[PDB]
């Protein structure tokens, strides 16, 4: 059901939607979305699960 509700259909589309959520107004670009998603949870300098 969540997949049916979900409008995205590809990895780039999902990254673009996430970037649009995080930074309203800024133009969603491939590089920007990739960097944001990588730094959100998979970067040691930003995420630290002690």
């Amino acid at each position: 059901e969540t997949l049916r509700v979900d409008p995205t259909n590809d990895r780039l589309s999902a990254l673009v939607e996430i970037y649009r959520m995080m930074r309203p107004g800024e133009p969603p670009t491939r590089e920007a979305a990739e960097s944001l998603f990588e730094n959100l949870f998979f970067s040691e300098d930003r995420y630290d699960l002690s």
Partner: protein, 136 residues
């Protein structure tokens, strides 16, 4: 693809932002007019920016995002015509680069001959705004 934007950098930090942007492969342009200034010596040869706290930036938005540029050290903010940042045509900046000492060329000469920087930047901004309006 490749475009040109305007950046208002933090006061007194023009060269720092310039070198930081050069390190990021962004083509930074800032006119450097050499004239005579009233100093302890009379009318010494001084090279000064056309107007401080202003710099043209050539960078592909796809290659480098605008958020990175806004977070570059030494820069304060962008110059945007409306919600989106303004785009500067290549012809006008190319002409400005070509005409170092000097219709459009008359405007460049008029900008260069004025000895008041606060008026120099306003005249240059008027010229670029006219060129943008003509282009669009």
């Amino acid at each position: 693809m490749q475009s040109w934007y305007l950046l208002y950098c933090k006061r007194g930090q023009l060269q720092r932002a310039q070198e930081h942007l050069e390190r990021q492969a962004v083509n930074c342009l800032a006119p450097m007019i050499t004239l005579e200034k009233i100093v302890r010596g009379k009318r010494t040869a001084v090279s000064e920016p056309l107007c401080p706290n202003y710099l043209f930036v050539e960078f592909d938005p796809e290659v480098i995002h605008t958020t990175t540029i806004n977070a570059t050290r030494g820069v304060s903010h962008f110059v945007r015509f409306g919600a989106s940042p303004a785009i500067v045509p290549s012809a006008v900046i190319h002409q400005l680069s070509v005409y170092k000492p000097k219709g459009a060329f008359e405007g460049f000469q008029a900008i260069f001959t004025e000895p008041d920087g606060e008026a120099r930047c306003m005249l240059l901004l008027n010229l670029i705004n006219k060129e943008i309006k003509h282009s669009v």
